[PDB]
């Protein structure tokens, strides 16, 4: 098909992970009210409005410029100043 | 394999459906603190806890004693006063 979406601030999407269990991750330049790595499922997105719902939100006021899906789980994202793994099975 | 998982409160599991794309609900008794129809999936349950993280939770203060999954999103539940049915991609 072909669907728009983005996130509830607009702002440049500077990186971006498909994963092979469907799960779609975002990265997003800097705002302070809204994270940088947006985790969410497009099965359980309402084709109604075009701002996502996350599942997983990590990476407040944070400038996530690389992501990589290690595998079903977990997700190597990288910062201006940080290199992450997160988990989505963790909050931390 | 085998798993026993369970609500933050501990309470009778009145009905239980597994959906085809491995999305797990959960009918509980009456908390008022916690849902009586908790939405999970068991790829992203952390195994170092017997606690679940619902991705979606509904029907506070009620006891949900039976339900059905529908189709992929959809579920119908049945609280002890009123006939519900609960789509996961809207939060009504």
Known sequence: YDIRVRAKK??????????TNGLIA???DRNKHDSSLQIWDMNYHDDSHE???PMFSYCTNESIVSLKFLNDTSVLAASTKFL??????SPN
Not at 84 to 89: F, N, S
Request: aromatic letters at 0%; glycine letters at 10%.
């Open 10 to 19: 607009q702002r440049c999407i500077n990186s971006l992970g498909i994963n």
């Open 26 to 28: 975002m990265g997003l």
């Open 84 to 89: 992450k793994e997160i988990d989505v099975r």
């Open 51 to 53: 701002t996502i719902n």
